[PDB]
Design a protein around this ligand. Sequence first.
Ligand code: NAD
Ligand code: NAD
Lengths: 271, 271
Amino acid sequence: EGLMQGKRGLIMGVANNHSLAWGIAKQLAAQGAELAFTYQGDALGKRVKPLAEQVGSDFVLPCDVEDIATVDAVFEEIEKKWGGLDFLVHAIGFSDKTELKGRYADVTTRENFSRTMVISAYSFTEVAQRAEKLMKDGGSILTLTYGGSTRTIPNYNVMGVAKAALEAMVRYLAADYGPQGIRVNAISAGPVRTLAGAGIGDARAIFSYQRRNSPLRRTVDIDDVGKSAVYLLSDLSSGVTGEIHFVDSGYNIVSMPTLEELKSSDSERGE
Amino acid sequence: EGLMQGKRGLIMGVANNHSLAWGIAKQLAAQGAELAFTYQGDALGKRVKPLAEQVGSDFVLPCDVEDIATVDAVFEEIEKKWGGLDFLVHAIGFSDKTELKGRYADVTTRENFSRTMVISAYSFTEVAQRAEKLMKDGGSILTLTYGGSTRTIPNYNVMGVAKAALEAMVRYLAADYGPQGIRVNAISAGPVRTLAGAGIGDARAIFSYQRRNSPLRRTVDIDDVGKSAVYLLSDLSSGVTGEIHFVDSGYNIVSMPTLEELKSSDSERGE
Ligand SMILES: NC(=O)c1ccc[n+]([C@@H]2O[C@H](COP(=O)([O-])OP(=O)(O)OC[C@H]3O[C@@H](n4cnc5c(N)ncnc54)[C@H](O)[C@@H]3O)[C@@H](O)[C@H]2O)c1
Ligand SMILES: NC(=O)c1ccc[n+]([C@@H]2O[C@H](COP(=O)([O-])OP(=O)(O)OC[C@H]3O[C@@H](n4cnc5c(N)ncnc54)[C@H](O)[C@@H]3O)[C@@H](O)[C@H]2O)c1
């Protein structure tokens, strides 16, 4: 009866119970999925193990996607225990925070660019390559992206470049794996804040703008993202592959803020 | 348990058991929805009424969207019998078939342009306007489009122009209605052998191209489309509005046919 009943899959990217990957995990488990989780570092493992237990999983493995040996070992354990995979969720990203402020042109370095590209984008290709060997009967693979890939957002900087590369990977992988019945998609999530308010500093001003000016007049939460993940990972989306699916309260469709905010900014800042 | 349990909605566009609207109706009914139907033309009443009976509905009303009095009469009847709507499905398209063969520039007339625009695009605005008054606590509105809106397809001609206008309406309506909790979306479906579908010249060659060269190597059926409609009309998609959602086997992401087909066409047709 559940949308994922009898399906088994791997969730990469839970750090705590505010993670987008955790919202995805909770919705998948409610729909009957059997889950495995990765965690980055012993400290996070002690957080992820009890969260996994809450949704009925004791299959929790260490992984640092920058160290490909740990990734190989994850899929070796999945093959040993399950022998196959029905789905994979990639919800992993990183960039040096010092380069996520100021202008992209001023702050970005090659060292951060290359590391960001590996962790935030190429790791998706690497785990897709390994998942494919375990999806002989088809499957569904999902990653998380953000609209800074295709429209410029202050401070998002080299992460926007990394997400643009990630979205192209979604397309090439979907074209590669489609004929074997493996679907590859992304959710382009709106900004998420599980904490109250809009926050502090630059980030508060960027977040509150999206809250005030998205069509739904709210930011999505990790349950919205998780329910859309259930759709893309389940047979409901059997016709869908290569899709960059916006789950962002419609924010991507608008050009401008509300008329009330246009007028206040016009008077405050001038011609 | 059903994703649409307790929800009531209107489906416009069933013509027979191959219609996209019918696949949508079957999936919604299987998720617990209570359904109302319109049908175009007296002779279609005897085809739509037994289909609606298969999903437990005899709320079936004539409607020709070109005659706004019949549309008003439908929504008046919904207000009297239900007092409210939870969702609306717009699956209506029309163009003079003589202008869906040949070059767009050679065959299109103003008379067909204006009638195609009213029936295939503006009727969506008209039924959304009427649905809004009956969705006091929110709702979801869905239409169906095709990728000929944004990439040219031979013979699709003024239907592509009408779908481009329809997709803009999805965005403007989503921006208007989002603050009151009404989501507005479209499915861009792959090709399906329907009555309307066969109206395009050389339908067979255009259809088989998408079959052979889509990533999934199949064209979607009305069950694929119906399940995606369940997603967009249900609470699973609570974070989604203004979205042109491709349910087309990934076809929109590719530039070219398969390498095998590229080589055969290269040999057969030359430089
Ligand atoms: N937070 C948002 O508002 C938002 C919006 C849109 C998209 N996203 C994307 O969603 C994904 C999840 O981010 P989040 O917001 O849930 O934050 P998060 O901090 O909870 O999740 C990011 C995860 O990536 C993991 N990670 C980072 N470097 C890694 C490495 N080298 N090896 C293995 N794992 C590594 C972290 O351990 C963490 O579990 C990211 O890709 C992010 O870009 C987030
Ligand atoms: N068939 C495909 O390949 C395809 C692909 C993508 C999108 N679509 C869209 O799906 C929708 C449904 O078409 P279909 O393929 O299911 O074909 P169909 O022939 O089963 O349905 C088209 C419907 O439009 C109705 N209609 C036409 N003019 C009307 C009018 N004046 N008033 C009321 N209803 C009217 C017809 O009665 C019919 O029920 C259309 O918008 C079409 O453009 C179709």
